[PDB]
Amino acid sequence: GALTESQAALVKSSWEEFNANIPKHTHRFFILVLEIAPAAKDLFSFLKGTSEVPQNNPELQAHAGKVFKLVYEAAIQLEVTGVVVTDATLKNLGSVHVSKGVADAHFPVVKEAILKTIKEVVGAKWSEELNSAWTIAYDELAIVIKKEMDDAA
Ligand code: HEM
Ligand SMILES: [F-]
């Protein structure tokens, strides 16, 4: 699809709609994770020892917001520039995933949980042209993190 001026306009618009409700969209995002894969729960310090996903845990919210911001920035950078740029942050990201016991096969888990989360966030505006656009941007960003984990291990 590329990333036409018209596709980019569509991701920006849909991310703005996401940030508009962090405690919701972030606790949703963790449940769609634990639905696609239950075991994933022992990984998270703030989920260990718990039974249910905490709803007002700042550690949890801060964590999940950073996740989506990073996917959106990726999409604009693709329409302007044509690419996703790897910086210090993405590199330290890769380290911390490895410490915590995260692998590649975990990533379609978190993608589906993010497409499903954005299809839920935009509702009737949803178009092929938009699904195509977030898919392009996540795939493009995951390519870059997975790269950095492999490197931290
Ligand atoms: C493009 C996709 C992804 C992005 C942008 C991303 C981003 C991040 C960030 C920014 C942090 C640190 C947050 C903090 O310091 O507060 C983090 C931590 C973590 N991530 Fe990810 N992530 C991605 C995919 C995944 C996947 C597939 C998994 C596996 C289930 C995962 C598991 C974790 C865990 C266990 C931690 C440590 C949390 C701790 O115990 O406190 N991430 N991730
Ligand atoms: F994460």
UniProtKB/Swiss-Prot annotation:
InterPro entries from the xrefs?
A: Globin, Globin-like_sf, Globin/Proto, Leghaemoglobin-like, Leghaemoglobin_Fe_BS
Residue numbers of Phosphoserine PTMs: S45
Keywords, comma-separated and alphabetical: Cytoplasm, Heme, Iron, Metal-binding, Nitration, Nitrogen fixation, Nodulation, Nucleus, Oxygen transport, Phosphoprotein, Transport
What GO MF terms are annotated?
A: heme binding; metal ion binding; oxygen binding; oxygen carrier activity
Q: Which Pfam families match?
A: Globin
Tissue spec: Root nodules.
Presence of keyword Iron: yes
Q: Where in the cell is it found?
A: Cytoplasm, Cytosol; Nucleus
Q: How is it modified after translation?
A: Nitrated in effective nodules and particularly in hypoxic conditions; this mechanism may play a protective role in the symbiosis by buffering toxic peroxynitrite NO(2)(-). Nitration level decrease during nodule senescence.
Q: Which GO terms describe its cellular component?
A: cytosol; nucleus
Tell me which stretches of the chain form a coiled coil: none
Positions contributing to heme b binding: S45, K66, H97, K100
| Record GO biological process | nodulation; response to nitrate
> Nitrated tyrosine (modified residue): where?
Y138
Q: Where is the Globin domain?
A: 2-150
Q: What induces it?
A: Repressed by nitrate in a dose-dependent manner.
Q: Where does O2 bind?
A: H63
Q: How does it assemble?
A: Monomer.
Tell me the protein family, please.
Belongs to the plant globin family.
Its biological function? Leghemoglobin that reversibly binds oxygen O(2) through a pentacoordinated heme iron. In root nodules, facilitates the diffusion of oxygen to the bacteroids while preventing the bacterial nitrogenase from being inactivated by buffering dioxygen, nitric oxide and carbon monoxide, and promoting the formation of reactive oxygen species (ROS, e.g. H(2)O(2)). This role is essential for symbiotic nitrogen fixation (SNF).
Q: What is this protein called?
A: Leghemoglobin-2
Species, as recorded: Lupinus luteus
